């Protein structure tokens, strides 16, 4: 499920919206929790 | 009635270190966002 440039509708921000919205999977988890230097942006992210 | 006041040049060297800091606006962007309506809102700000 790839990255690579479009080639289907816009592949670069899509999500399930099936033909009904607000759907998402059971098990939300995707990540190890960890906390530290705390942003508010992306781009302060960047900057440090 | 004596005077001693050890309060007030206490304060008064505190409030003159925020006086010499001062913290007006800057308009960061958000997350995903680069750099655009960033001098838009800033240059409403700093001409009034």
Same mark, same amino acid.
Request: glycine fraction near 6%; aromatic fraction near 6%.
């Given at each position: 499920?790839? %990255? ?12 399930? @919206? ?8 059971? @098990? ?7 906390? @530290? ?5 992306? %781009? ?5 | ?31 995903? /966002?680069?750099?655009? /309506? ?11």
């Amino acid at each position: 499920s790839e %990255k690579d440039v479009q080639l289907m509708a816009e592949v670069v921000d899509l999500a399930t @919206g099936e033909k009904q919205v607000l759907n998402d999977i059971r @098990g939300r988890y995707e990540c190890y929790t960890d906390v @530290g230097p705390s942003f508010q942006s992306m %781009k302060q992210q960047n900057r440090a | 009635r004596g005077q001693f006041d050890v309060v007030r040049p206490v304060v008064r060297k505190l409030v003159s270190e925020m006086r010499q800091n001062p913290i007006d606006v800057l308009y960061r962007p958000k997350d995903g /966002a680069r750099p655009d /309506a960033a001098d838009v809102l800033m240059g409403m700000y700093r001409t009034d």
